[PDB]
Amino acid sequence: MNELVDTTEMYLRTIYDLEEEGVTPLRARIAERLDQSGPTVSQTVSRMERDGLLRVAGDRHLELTEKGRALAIAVMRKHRLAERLLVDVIGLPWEEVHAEACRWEHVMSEDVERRLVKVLNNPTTSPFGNPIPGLDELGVLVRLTELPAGSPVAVVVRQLTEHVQGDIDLITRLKDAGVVPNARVTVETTPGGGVTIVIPGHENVTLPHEMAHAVKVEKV
Amino acid sequence: MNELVDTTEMYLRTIYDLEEEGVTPLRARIAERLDQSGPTVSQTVSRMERDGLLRVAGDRHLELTEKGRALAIAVMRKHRLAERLLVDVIGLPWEEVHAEACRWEHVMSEDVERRLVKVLNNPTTSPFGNPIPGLDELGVGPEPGADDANLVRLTELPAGSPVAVVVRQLTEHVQGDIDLITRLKDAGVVPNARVTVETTPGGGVTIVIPGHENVTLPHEMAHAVKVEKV
Ligand SMILES: [Co+2]
Ligand SMILES: [Co+2]
Ligand SMILES: [Co+2]
Ligand SMILES: [Co+2]
Ligand SMILES: [Co+2]
Ligand SMILES: [Co+2]
């Protein structure tokens, strides 16, 4: 089958993901993250633009229309409710719920979502600390790249957005290092964009710049 | 998206469904149930035959190869574990779980299935009474006792006076007709329910339940119900 399960929904969530990372939603990012050629993402975006889902600007940045935004929120809502179910009730390992939820978000109905809100006891966040959007319509902080250079700082981990969950090796390293929602950790800025989690007496864990954008923390 | 989610997997499970119903698996039945044109299924069948998933027999019937049957079993196992999860844990109405699970069966990993057998307390049957197949591939060892009894499809009961039976299984085909599966739910025609059944002129069967309107099953749906005479 189609590896993306629902191509149009993944284009929408990817753009939403990029907005959550504070980076500019571009066709080049969609191609890299969804493993699709330049031509292919251009054709698909034009089709989505035709269908009133996206707006392409002269400078190349992609925006979601009001119509496309509501659909993006609905997919992300199913994604984060599925991750809570997978972690809290099913017991699938933390670092594995993202790939599973990335498939389930395309087939879950809103009736299951509403049942999950009650079964999971009104969850407001995913297992990675991200807010669950669209609960209203269902019917029911600093980023790691904004830190002074060359100096350590004590922070409280709040969110790990969807981009960083896509790198299993890295997400496993972060989990093992205690980089999980609501945990306290001290980080240090690496000269070339990346950030570093300080681990006393052990090799530190380096977050490349694109992954540092995907981690939201609170200054202690 | 593709409304079937995974077309090859629906092809595989439709042939398995037809075998559970005791009817000949045919391209025409796939076309009708999956809503595809004759050519489209003719072209998918050939491709799946060349991919070693099935074969077209001399008399036209469709047969799963060994390779295809293991794949069909994995889809059905996922389907029926998804149904158990939807009813026991999520609480989605019994009559709505089949359509949901028909989508979930194509995206559930074996890792999740392995967790579900533990979380659901070692299930062996779906909420429609059908045995969950291929549990040995998930690491479940068989339990003492064998699966069966004295099960007769409703289409095997003889024409005559009303017969008292206990419903044991409702296969995927009757679940796929939302109006009928909802009527069976509302009349209490569920696994282990006691009803009386009478054969109808054209191969159909009428189910009589005290306090509810009769539920008449066309012959194709009667094939999907397995009972035991009281
Ligand atoms: Co995720
Ligand atoms: Co996805
Ligand atoms: Co940046
Ligand atoms: Co017949
Ligand atoms: Co079913
Ligand atoms: Co299906």
Coordinates of C-alpha atoms and ligand atoms in Angstrom, one line a residue:
Chain A
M1 CA 0.0 0.0 0.0
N2 CA 0.8 3.7 0.2
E3 CA 3.5 4.0 2.9
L4 CA 2.0 7.4 4.0
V5 CA -1.4 5.8 4.4
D6 CA -3.2 9.1 3.5
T7 CA -0.8 11.3 1.5
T8 CA -3.0 14.5 1.7
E9 CA -3.3 14.2 5.5
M10 CA 0.5 13.7 5.8
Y11 CA 1.1 16.9 3.7
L12 CA -1.2 18.8 6.1
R13 CA 0.3 17.4 9.3
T14 CA 3.9 18.0 8.1
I15 CA 3.1 21.7 7.5
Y16 CA 1.5 21.9 10.9
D17 CA 4.6 20.1 12.4
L18 CA 6.9 22.7 10.7
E19 CA 4.8 25.5 12.3
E20 CA 5.1 23.8 15.7
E21 CA 8.9 23.8 15.2
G22 CA 8.9 27.5 14.3
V23 CA 10.5 26.8 10.9
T24 CA 9.2 27.9 7.5
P25 CA 6.9 25.4 5.9
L26 CA 8.4 24.7 2.5
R27 CA 8.0 22.1 -0.2
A28 CA 11.7 21.1 0.3
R29 CA 10.9 20.0 3.9
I30 CA 7.9 18.0 2.7
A31 CA 10.0 16.2 0.1
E32 CA 12.7 15.3 2.7
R33 CA 10.4 14.2 5.5
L34 CA 7.9 12.2 3.4
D35 CA 10.6 10.9 1.0
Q36 CA 9.0 12.2 -2.2
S37 CA 10.6 13.8 -5.2
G38 CA 10.5 17.6 -5.9
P39 CA 8.1 17.2 -8.9
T40 CA 5.8 14.9 -6.8
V41 CA 5.5 17.3 -3.9
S42 CA 5.0 20.2 -6.3
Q43 CA 2.2 18.4 -8.1
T44 CA 0.6 17.3 -4.8
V45 CA 0.7 20.8 -3.3
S46 CA -0.8 22.3 -6.4
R47 CA -3.7 19.8 -6.2
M48 CA -4.1 20.7 -2.5
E49 CA -4.0 24.4 -3.4
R50 CA -6.6 23.7 -6.1
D51 CA -8.7 22.0 -3.4
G52 CA -8.7 25.0 -1.1
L53 CA -6.4 23.4 1.5
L54 CA -3.1 25.3 1.2
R55 CA -1.8 28.7 -0.1
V56 CA 1.6 29.0 -1.7
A57 CA 3.3 32.4 -1.5
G58 CA 5.6 34.2 -3.9
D59 CA 8.5 33.6 -1.5
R60 CA 7.7 29.8 -1.5
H61 CA 6.4 29.4 2.1
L62 CA 3.3 27.2 2.5
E63 CA 0.3 28.2 4.6
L64 CA -2.8 26.3 5.6
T65 CA -6.1 27.8 4.6
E66 CA -8.8 27.8 7.3
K67 CA -10.2 24.6 5.6
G68 CA -6.8 22.9 5.5
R69 CA -6.0 23.9 9.1
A70 CA -9.2 22.3 10.6
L71 CA -8.3 19.1 8.8
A72 CA -4.6 19.3 10.0
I73 CA -5.8 19.8 13.6
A74 CA -8.1 16.7 13.3
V75 CA -5.3 14.5 12.1
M76 CA -2.9 15.7 14.9
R77 CA -5.7 15.2 17.5
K78 CA -6.1 11.6 16.4
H79 CA -2.3 11.2 16.4
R80 CA -1.9 12.4 20.0
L81 CA -4.9 10.6 21.3
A82 CA -3.6 7.4 19.7
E83 CA -0.1 7.9 21.3
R84 CA -1.8 8.3 24.8
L85 CA -3.8 5.1 24.2
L86 CA -0.6 3.3 23.0
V87 CA 1.5 4.3 25.9
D88 CA -0.9 4.4 28.8
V89 CA -3.3 1.5 28.0
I90 CA -1.7 -0.7 25.4
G91 CA 1.8 -0.5 26.9
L92 CA 3.8 -0.1 23.6
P93 CA 7.2 1.3 24.4
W94 CA 7.4 5.1 24.4
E95 CA 9.9 5.4 21.5
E96 CA 7.7 3.2 19.3
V97 CA 4.2 4.9 19.7
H98 CA 5.0 7.7 17.2
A99 CA 5.4 5.4 14.1
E100 CA 2.3 3.5 15.1
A101 CA 0.3 6.6 15.7
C102 CA 1.5 8.1 12.4
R103 CA -0.4 5.2 10.7
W104 CA -3.4 5.2 13.1
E105 CA -4.1 8.9 12.7
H106 CA -5.3 8.3 9.2
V107 CA -8.0 5.7 10.0
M108 CA -9.4 6.6 13.5
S109 CA -13.0 8.0 13.4
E110 CA -14.1 10.9 15.6
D111 CA -16.4 8.5 17.5
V112 CA -13.3 6.6 18.7
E113 CA -11.6 9.9 19.5
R114 CA -14.5 10.9 21.7
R115 CA -14.4 7.5 23.4
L116 CA -10.7 7.9 24.0
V117 CA -11.2 11.3 25.7
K118 CA -13.3 9.6 28.3
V119 CA -11.2 6.4 28.5
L120 CA -8.0 8.4 28.9
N121 CA -9.6 10.7 31.5
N122 CA -9.5 14.0 29.6
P123 CA -5.9 14.0 28.3
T124 CA -4.6 17.5 27.3
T125 CA -1.2 16.4 26.1
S126 CA 0.4 13.6 24.2
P127 CA 3.1 11.3 25.8
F128 CA 5.7 13.7 24.4
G129 CA 4.2 16.7 26.2
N130 CA 2.6 18.3 23.1
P131 CA -0.9 19.8 23.5
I132 CA -3.7 17.9 22.0
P133 CA -5.4 20.3 19.6
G134 CA -9.0 20.5 18.4
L135 CA -10.8 19.1 21.5
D136 CA -13.2 22.0 21.2
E137 CA -14.2 21.1 17.7
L138 CA -14.2 17.4 18.6
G139 CA -17.0 18.3 20.9
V140 CA -15.4 18.1 24.3
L141 CA 8.0 28.3 26.9
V142 CA 11.2 28.6 25.0
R143 CA 12.7 26.5 22.2
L144 CA 16.1 24.9 22.6
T145 CA 17.5 27.1 19.7
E146 CA 16.9 30.3 21.7
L147 CA 19.7 29.8 24.3
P148 CA 22.7 32.0 25.0
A149 CA 25.7 30.5 23.2
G150 CA 28.5 28.6 24.8
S151 CA 26.9 28.3 28.3
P152 CA 24.9 25.7 30.3
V153 CA 21.4 26.4 31.6
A154 CA 19.0 24.5 33.9
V155 CA 15.7 23.7 32.2
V156 CA 12.5 21.7 32.5
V157 CA 11.6 19.6 29.5
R158 CA 8.0 20.4 28.3
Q159 CA 7.6 19.1 24.7
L160 CA 9.3 16.9 22.0
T161 CA 7.4 17.7 18.8
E162 CA 6.7 15.2 16.0
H163 CA 9.9 15.8 14.0
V164 CA 12.2 14.5 16.7
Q165 CA 10.0 11.5 17.4
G166 CA 10.7 10.4 13.7
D167 CA 14.3 9.7 14.7
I168 CA 14.1 6.6 16.7
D169 CA 17.8 6.3 17.6
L170 CA 17.8 9.9 18.9
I171 CA 14.5 9.6 20.7
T172 CA 15.8 6.4 22.5
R173 CA 19.0 8.3 23.5
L174 CA 16.9 11.2 24.9
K175 CA 14.6 8.9 26.8
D176 CA 17.6 7.1 28.3
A177 CA 19.1 10.5 29.3
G178 CA 15.9 11.5 31.0
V179 CA 14.9 14.1 28.4
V180 CA 11.2 13.5 28.9
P181 CA 8.3 15.8 29.7
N182 CA 8.5 17.5 33.0
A183 CA 12.1 16.3 33.7
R184 CA 14.8 18.8 34.8
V185 CA 18.0 18.7 32.7
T186 CA 20.9 21.1 32.0
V187 CA 21.8 21.9 28.4
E188 CA 24.7 23.6 26.7
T189 CA 24.8 25.4 23.3
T190 CA 27.0 23.9 20.6
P191 CA 28.6 26.6 18.3
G192 CA 27.2 25.3 15.0
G193 CA 23.5 25.4 15.7
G194 CA 23.1 22.2 17.7
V195 CA 22.4 22.0 21.4
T196 CA 23.9 19.5 24.0
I197 CA 22.3 17.7 26.9
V198 CA 24.9 17.6 29.7
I199 CA 25.4 14.1 31.1
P200 CA 27.8 13.9 34.1
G201 CA 30.6 11.4 33.5
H202 CA 29.3 10.2 30.1
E203 CA 29.2 11.2 26.5
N204 CA 26.7 14.0 26.1
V205 CA 23.8 13.8 23.7
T206 CA 23.9 16.3 20.9
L207 CA 20.7 17.6 19.2
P208 CA 21.3 18.8 15.7
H209 CA 19.7 22.2 15.1
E210 CA 16.6 20.9 13.3
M211 CA 15.9 18.7 16.4
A212 CA 16.7 21.5 18.8
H213 CA 13.8 23.4 17.1
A214 CA 11.6 20.4 18.1
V215 CA 12.3 20.5 21.8
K216 CA 10.4 23.1 23.9
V217 CA 11.6 23.8 27.4
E218 CA 10.9 26.1 30.3
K219 CA 13.7 28.1 32.0
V220 CA 13.9 27.0 35.7
Chain B
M1 CA -7.3 8.3 0.4
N2 CA -7.9 4.7 -0.8
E3 CA -11.1 3.8 1.0
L4 CA -9.9 0.2 1.3
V5 CA -6.7 1.5 2.9
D6 CA -4.7 -1.5 1.6
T7 CA -6.2 -3.0 -1.6
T8 CA -4.1 -6.1 -1.7
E9 CA -5.0 -6.9 1.9
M10 CA -8.7 -6.5 1.3
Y11 CA -8.5 -8.9 -1.6
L12 CA -6.7 -11.5 0.6
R13 CA -9.2 -11.1 3.5
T14 CA -12.2 -11.1 1.1
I15 CA -11.1 -14.6 -0.2
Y16 CA -10.6 -15.7 3.4
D17 CA -14.1 -14.4 4.3
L18 CA -15.6 -16.3 1.4
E19 CA -13.9 -19.5 2.7
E20 CA -15.3 -18.9 6.2
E21 CA -18.8 -18.5 4.6
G22 CA -18.4 -21.9 2.8
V23 CA -19.0 -20.2 -0.6
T24 CA -16.8 -20.3 -3.7
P25 CA -14.2 -17.4 -3.8
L26 CA -14.8 -15.7 -7.1
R27 CA -13.6 -12.5 -8.8
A28 CA -17.2 -11.4 -9.2
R29 CA -17.8 -11.5 -5.5
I30 CA -14.6 -9.4 -4.9
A31 CA -15.8 -6.8 -7.4
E32 CA -19.2 -6.5 -5.7
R33 CA -18.0 -6.4 -2.1
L34 CA -15.0 -4.1 -2.7
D35 CA -16.9 -2.0 -5.2
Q36 CA -14.5 -2.4 -8.1
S37 CA -15.1 -3.0 -11.8
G38 CA -14.6 -6.4 -13.4
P39 CA -11.5 -5.3 -15.3
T40 CA -10.0 -3.7 -12.1
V41 CA -10.3 -6.9 -10.1
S42 CA -9.3 -9.0 -13.2
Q43 CA -6.1 -6.9 -13.4
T44 CA -5.5 -7.0 -9.6
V45 CA -6.0 -10.8 -9.4
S46 CA -3.5 -11.4 -12.2
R47 CA -0.9 -9.2 -10.5
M48 CA -1.5 -11.0 -7.2
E49 CA -1.2 -14.3 -9.0
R50 CA 2.1 -13.3 -10.5
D51 CA 3.2 -12.0 -7.1
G52 CA 2.5 -15.5 -5.7
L53 CA -0.4 -14.5 -3.4
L54 CA -3.1 -16.6 -5.1
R55 CA -3.9 -18.6 -8.1
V56 CA -6.9 -18.8 -10.5
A57 CA -8.0 -22.5 -10.5
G58 CA -9.1 -24.4 -13.6
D59 CA -12.8 -23.9 -12.7
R60 CA -12.2 -20.1 -12.1
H61 CA -12.3 -20.1 -8.3
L62 CA -9.7 -18.2 -6.4
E63 CA -7.3 -20.0 -4.2
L64 CA -4.8 -18.4 -1.7
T65 CA -1.2 -19.7 -2.1
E66 CA 0.5 -20.6 1.2
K67 CA 2.2 -17.2 1.1
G68 CA -1.1 -15.5 0.5
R69 CA -2.9 -17.4 3.3
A70 CA -0.3 -16.5 5.9
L71 CA -0.8 -12.8 4.9
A72 CA -4.7 -13.1 4.9
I73 CA -4.5 -14.7 8.4
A74 CA -2.4 -11.8 9.7
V75 CA -4.9 -9.3 8.4
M76 CA -7.8 -11.2 10.0
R77 CA -5.9 -11.6 13.3
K78 CA -5.4 -7.8 13.4
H79 CA -9.0 -7.2 12.4
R80 CA -10.4 -9.3 15.3
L81 CA -7.9 -8.0 17.9
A82 CA -8.9 -4.5 16.9
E83 CA -12.6 -5.4 17.3
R84 CA -11.8 -6.8 20.8
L85 CA -9.9 -3.6 21.7
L86 CA -12.7 -1.4 20.3
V87 CA -15.4 -3.2 22.4
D88 CA -13.6 -4.1 25.6
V89 CA -11.4 -1.1 26.1
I90 CA -12.6 1.8 24.0
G91 CA -16.4 1.1 24.3
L92 CA -17.4 1.8 20.7
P93 CA -20.9 0.4 19.9
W94 CA -20.7 -3.3 18.9
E95 CA -22.4 -2.6 15.6
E96 CA -19.8 0.1 14.6
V97 CA -16.6 -1.8 15.5
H98 CA -16.5 -3.8 12.2
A99 CA -16.1 -0.8 9.9
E100 CA -13.5 0.8 12.2
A101 CA -11.6 -2.5 12.4
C102 CA -11.7 -2.9 8.6
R103 CA -9.5 0.2 8.4
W104 CA -7.4 -0.6 11.5
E105 CA -6.5 -4.1 10.4
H106 CA -4.2 -2.6 7.7
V107 CA -2.1 -0.3 9.9
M108 CA -1.7 -2.3 13.2
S109 CA 1.8 -3.7 13.7
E110 CA 2.5 -7.1 15.1
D111 CA 4.1 -5.3 18.0
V112 CA 0.8 -3.8 19.0
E113 CA -1.0 -7.2 18.5
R114 CA 1.5 -8.8 20.9
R115 CA 0.7 -6.1 23.5
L116 CA -3.1 -6.6 22.8
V117 CA -3.1 -10.3 23.5
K118 CA -1.8 -9.5 27.0
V119 CA -3.9 -6.3 27.6
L120 CA -7.1 -8.1 26.4
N121 CA -6.4 -11.1 28.8
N122 CA -5.6 -13.7 26.1
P123 CA -8.6 -13.4 23.7
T124 CA -9.3 -16.2 21.3
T125 CA -12.5 -14.9 19.7
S126 CA -13.8 -11.6 18.2
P127 CA -16.9 -9.9 19.7
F128 CA -18.9 -11.6 16.8
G129 CA -17.8 -15.0 18.1
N130 CA -15.2 -15.8 15.4
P131 CA -12.0 -17.4 16.4
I132 CA -9.0 -15.2 16.1
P133 CA -6.6 -17.0 13.7
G134 CA -2.8 -17.1 13.6
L135 CA -2.2 -16.5 17.3
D136 CA 0.7 -19.0 17.2
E137 CA 2.7 -16.4 15.0
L138 CA 2.4 -13.9 17.9
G139 CA 3.9 -16.4 20.4
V140 CA 0.7 -17.7 21.9
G141 CA 0.9 -21.4 22.8
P142 CA -2.3 -23.3 22.3
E143 CA -4.5 -24.2 25.2
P144 CA -6.0 -27.6 26.1
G145 CA -9.2 -28.3 24.2
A146 CA -10.0 -28.0 20.5
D147 CA -11.9 -25.3 18.6
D148 CA -15.3 -26.6 17.3
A149 CA -18.4 -28.4 18.6
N150 CA -21.5 -29.1 16.4
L151 CA -21.6 -25.9 14.4
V152 CA -23.9 -25.6 11.4
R153 CA -24.1 -22.6 9.1
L154 CA -27.7 -21.3 8.9
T155 CA -28.0 -22.3 5.2
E156 CA -27.4 -26.0 6.3
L157 CA -30.6 -26.2 8.4
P158 CA -33.4 -28.1 6.7
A159 CA -36.6 -26.6 5.3
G160 CA -39.4 -27.2 7.8
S161 CA -40.8 -26.0 11.2
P162 CA -39.0 -23.4 13.3
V163 CA -35.8 -24.6 14.9
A164 CA -34.5 -23.4 18.3
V165 CA -30.8 -22.6 18.0
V166 CA -28.0 -20.8 19.8
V167 CA -26.1 -18.2 17.7
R168 CA -22.3 -18.8 17.9
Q169 CA -20.7 -16.8 15.1
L170 CA -21.5 -13.9 12.7
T171 CA -18.7 -13.8 10.1
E172 CA -17.3 -10.6 8.5
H173 CA -19.8 -10.4 5.6
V174 CA -22.9 -9.9 7.8
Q175 CA -21.0 -7.4 9.9
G176 CA -20.4 -5.4 6.7
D177 CA -24.1 -4.6 6.1
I178 CA -24.4 -1.8 8.7
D179 CA -28.2 -1.8 8.7
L180 CA -28.5 -5.6 9.2
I181 CA -25.7 -5.8 11.9
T182 CA -27.5 -3.0 13.7
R183 CA -30.8 -4.8 13.5
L184 CA -29.2 -8.0 14.8
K185 CA -27.7 -6.0 17.7
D186 CA -31.0 -4.4 18.6
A187 CA -32.9 -7.7 18.5
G188 CA -30.2 -9.3 20.6
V189 CA -29.1 -11.7 17.8
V190 CA -25.5 -12.0 19.2
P191 CA -23.0 -14.7 20.1
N192 CA -24.6 -17.1 22.5
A193 CA -28.2 -15.8 22.1
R194 CA -31.1 -18.2 21.8
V195 CA -33.4 -17.7 18.8
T196 CA -35.7 -19.7 16.5
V197 CA -35.0 -19.9 12.8
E198 CA -37.1 -20.9 9.8
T199 CA -36.0 -21.5 6.2
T200 CA -37.5 -19.2 3.6
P201 CA -38.5 -20.1 0.0
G202 CA -35.5 -18.6 -1.8
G203 CA -32.6 -19.9 0.5
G204 CA -33.1 -17.1 3.0
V205 CA -33.8 -17.7 6.7
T206 CA -36.1 -15.9 9.1
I207 CA -34.9 -15.3 12.7
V208 CA -37.7 -15.0 15.2
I209 CA -36.9 -13.3 18.6
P210 CA -39.5 -12.8 21.3
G211 CA -40.3 -9.1 21.7
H212 CA -38.8 -7.9 18.4
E213 CA -39.6 -7.9 14.7
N214 CA -38.5 -10.9 12.7
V215 CA -35.1 -10.5 11.1
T216 CA -34.9 -12.1 7.6
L217 CA -31.5 -13.0 6.2
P218 CA -30.9 -13.3 2.5
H219 CA -29.1 -16.5 1.6
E220 CA -25.7 -14.8 1.4
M221 CA -26.0 -13.6 5.0
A222 CA -27.4 -16.9 6.2
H223 CA -24.0 -18.4 5.1
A224 CA -22.3 -15.9 7.5
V225 CA -24.1 -17.2 10.6
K226 CA -23.0 -20.3 12.4
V227 CA -25.3 -21.8 15.1
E228 CA -25.8 -24.9 17.3
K229 CA -29.2 -26.6 17.5
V230 CA -30.5 -26.4 21.1
Ligands
CO1 CO 4.1 11.4 17.4
CO2 CO 0.8 9.7 9.3
CO3 CO 16.6 27.6 13.2
CO4 CO -25.2 -21.2 -0.6
CO5 CO -15.4 -7.6 11.6
CO6 CO -10.1 -3.7 5.6

